[PDB]
Amino acid sequence: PQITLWKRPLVTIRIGGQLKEALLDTGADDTVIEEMNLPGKWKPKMIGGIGGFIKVRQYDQIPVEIAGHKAIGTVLVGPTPVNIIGRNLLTQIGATLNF
Amino acid sequence: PQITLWKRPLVTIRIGGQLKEALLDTGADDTVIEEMNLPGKWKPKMIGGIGGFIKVRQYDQIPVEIAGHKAIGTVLVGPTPVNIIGRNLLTQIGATLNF
Numbered sequence: 200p201q202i203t204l205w206k207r208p209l210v211t212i213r214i215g216g217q218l219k220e221a222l223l224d225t226g227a228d229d230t231v232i233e234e235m236n237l238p239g240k241w242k243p244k245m246i247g248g249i250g251g252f253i254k255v256r257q258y259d260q261i262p263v264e265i266a267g268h269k270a271i272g273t274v275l276v277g278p279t280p281v282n283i284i285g286r287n288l289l290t291q292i293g294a295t296l297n298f
Numbered sequence: 299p300q301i302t303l304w305k306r307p308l309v310t311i312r313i314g315g316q317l318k319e320a321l322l323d324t325g326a327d328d329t330v331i332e333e334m335n336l337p338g339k340w341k342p343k344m345i346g347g348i349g350g351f352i353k354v355r356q357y358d359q360i361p362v363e364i365a366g367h368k369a370i371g372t373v374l375v376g377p378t379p380v381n382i383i384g385r386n387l388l389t390q391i392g393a394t395l396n397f
């Protein structure tokens with residue numbers, strides 16, 4: 200599809216068997232999902248943005264379906280105000296910026 | 299042009315007559331530039347991100363050239379980790395997300 204940017208680019212994703220609304224974010228290196236009980240092992244880590252850093256749990260090889268497109272990769276879970284789909288997963292669904 | 303996301307989408311911009319590097323960020327509502335002197339009046343404002351809120355200087359109707367494309371709009375100046383071109387200017391150059 201072609202998504203314009205008049206509004207935040209929010210789409211439906213499926214992760215851990217749940218459907219969520221997430222932002223397609225070309226400015227995010229990683230994918231950050233709002234707090235949820237994903238099973239599996241994880242490693243702690245800190246990611247930073249405008250305002251400072253937050254602590255998150257890093258989960259590897261998690262399957263995520265983005266608007267019907269299947270992907271699988273690292274997902275960081277923590278207290279983010281919004282679900283963010285980063286470049287690590289966008290590259291997998293062949294997303295590009297065009298102008 | 300068509301930009302893929304295996305690397306951060308960094309491009310050269312011209313603002314205040316100066317050249318700088320900025321991230322094309324579909325996840326940013328606004329454009330936030332690192333501290334610098336920009337002619338004209340400005341208003342105090344606060345914006346939030348992953349790690350909380352920061353105080354910025356709001357500059358209105360500033361001409362910014364993004365990879366040869368012209369835009370004129372609001373630019374926020376403050377302590378950001380990187381120069382960010384947000385949706386307010388991306389829509390002016392006709393940027394879209396495609397996949």
Ligand SMILES: CC(C)CCN(C[C@@H](O)[C@@H]1Cc2ccc(cc2)OCCCC(=O)N[C@@H](C(C)C)C(=O)N1)S(=O)(=O)c1ccccc1
Nearest residue numbers: 224226227228229246247248249325326327328346347348
């Ligand atoms: C950009 C750089 C520093 C960091 C990469 N990050 C992606 C950006 O697009 C972030 C993502 C984001 C965060 C919070 C949100 C909405 C979106 O709710 C607030 C809405 C206001 C807004 O639009 N805030 C922008 C601001 C630049 C004007 C912002 O901070 N946007 S990030 O901090 O969230 C990260 C960092 C590391 C790993 C994943 C995500």
